[PDB]
Design a protein around this ligand. Structure first.
Ligand SMILES: O=C(NCCCN(CCCCN(CCCNC(=O)c1cccc(=O)n1O)C(=O)c1cccc(=O)n1O)C(=O)c1cccc(=O)n1O)c1cccc(=O)n1O
Ligand SMILES: [Cm+3]
Length: 177
């Protein structure tokens, strides 16, 4: 029981796919250095904290994906499964039925060099509402102004204005494990 208004998801034709995606090289820990999306809102009062997301390639070529967040003074863990989709670097969420309200969930790796940075596009439909976000990943907690400007540029090309783009503040708790 609500109302809400969302910037429309871009057509998928506007979201590049990393050429020749290498699933093994993409494994390991990534820090979320940038976040943009139609439900992302810059909040001056209570700024969003950096978290990390860990990709583990399984025998069957799906990823176990684990995100580690610092919240309420504890380390919080969200584990889920990315199942290979229609082309290399594209995934759907495994076990979608087990998430109530969730009808679709798409992941597309837009670009990466595997050992420093990545951008990843996510689109999900939940309670019939269409959310999308772009994540900027670093292998470390810092990235250059140049890379962050590129991420802002790309986010805008998908219809997002600046106040729907945030750069989570680096922290030491939980995510350096
Ligand atoms: O709009 C999006 N994100 C920005 C707002 C995130 N948020 C605020 C943060 C909440 C805190 N958590 C969520 C951590 C726990 N998660 C979940 O138990 C979960 C279960 C099933 C599906 C799913 O998606 N989740 O998250 C993150 O910081 C976190 C970390 C890592 C990955 C991740 O996804 N999240 O959120 C929301 O409440 C929200 C609003 C609307 C849709 C939505 O999916 N979420 O999570 C979005 C668009 C498309 C796919 C997608 O996954 N997301 O999040
Ligand atoms: Cm989410």
């Amino acid at each position: 029981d609500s109302t809400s208004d969302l910037i429309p998801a871009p057509p998928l034709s506007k979201v590049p796919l990393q050429q020749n995606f290498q699933d093994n090289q993409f494994q390991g820990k990534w820090y979320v250095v940038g976040l943009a999306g139609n439900a992302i809102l810059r909040e001056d009062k209570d700024p969003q904290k950096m978290y990390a997301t860990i990709y583990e390639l399984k025998e069957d070529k799906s990823y176990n994906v684990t995100s580690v967040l610092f919240r309420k003074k504890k380390c919080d863990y969200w584990i889920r499964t990315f199942v290979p989709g229609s082309q290399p670097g594209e995934f759907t969420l495994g076990n979608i039925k087990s998430y109530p309200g969730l009808t679709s969930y798409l992941v597309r790796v837009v670009s990466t060099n595997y050992n420093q940075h990545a951008m990843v596009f996510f689109k999900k439909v939940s309670q019939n509402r269409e959310y999308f976000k772009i994540t900027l990943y670093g292998r470390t907690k810092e990235l250059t102004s140049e890379l962050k400007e590129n991420f802002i540029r790309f986010s805008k090309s998908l219809g997002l204005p600046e106040n729907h783009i945030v750069f989570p503040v680096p922290i030491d708790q939980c995510i350096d494990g």
